[PDB]
Description:
alpha+beta; two-stranded antiparallel ribbon; binds calcium ion; nucleotidyltransferase; DNA-directed DNA polymerase; DNA replication; DNA repair
Amino acid sequence: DDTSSSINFLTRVTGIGPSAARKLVDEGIKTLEDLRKNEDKLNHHQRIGLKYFEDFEKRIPREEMLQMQDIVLNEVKKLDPEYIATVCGSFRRGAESSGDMDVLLTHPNFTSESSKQPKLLHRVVEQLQKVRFITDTLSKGETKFMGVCQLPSENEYPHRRIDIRLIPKDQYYCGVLYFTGSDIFNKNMRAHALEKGFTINEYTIRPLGVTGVAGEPLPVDSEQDIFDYIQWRYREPKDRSE
Ligand SMILES: [Ca+2]
């Protein structure tokens, strides 16, 4: 009922899961104003969320995405040029608006062999708060920063979720493809390759075989590379709606 109305609302707040949101109901926490008077009940995640309830619903215009992506990209150049940073999502695919900045990052330095270089992402984030670009954190791994950026005002913009993800360079491509999407594109891509005698995921591109159980990743220098394995004309990210 109109109470369920609640679990439905709360869940609107980031960090608030269903079971998570469920408890806030038992304690008698319902509206956001209920939230507000109870940060003490919230971990840091749910807290940033309520912070930016508003902003967190507006969408991201592309003019803005661009600006944001220039800043991210430039800084990363400064630290170490060997560093690669692709912005993914709808955005990469010409989308006119979007819901957040999704970044994929890698360094020749780190590969699926390494598996331990949080400083590599971290260095990346700091430069960013150093810049006043990132402005809050949501959570933060040794490989996946989750947070909240903000375009520089001249005088202001909304707060905006951003995610950085460290992926091995041997698995970056597959990874870039994946996060590019779109959903069905991925469905279709994987779909054909399976015909051409290959299996794919965000990590790799591997041959199939007898009984089907098989593998052993193939080399991937580019996104183009993957497409050649499957023998398709490389599809620009635009023509990827499916
Ligand atoms: Ca996202």
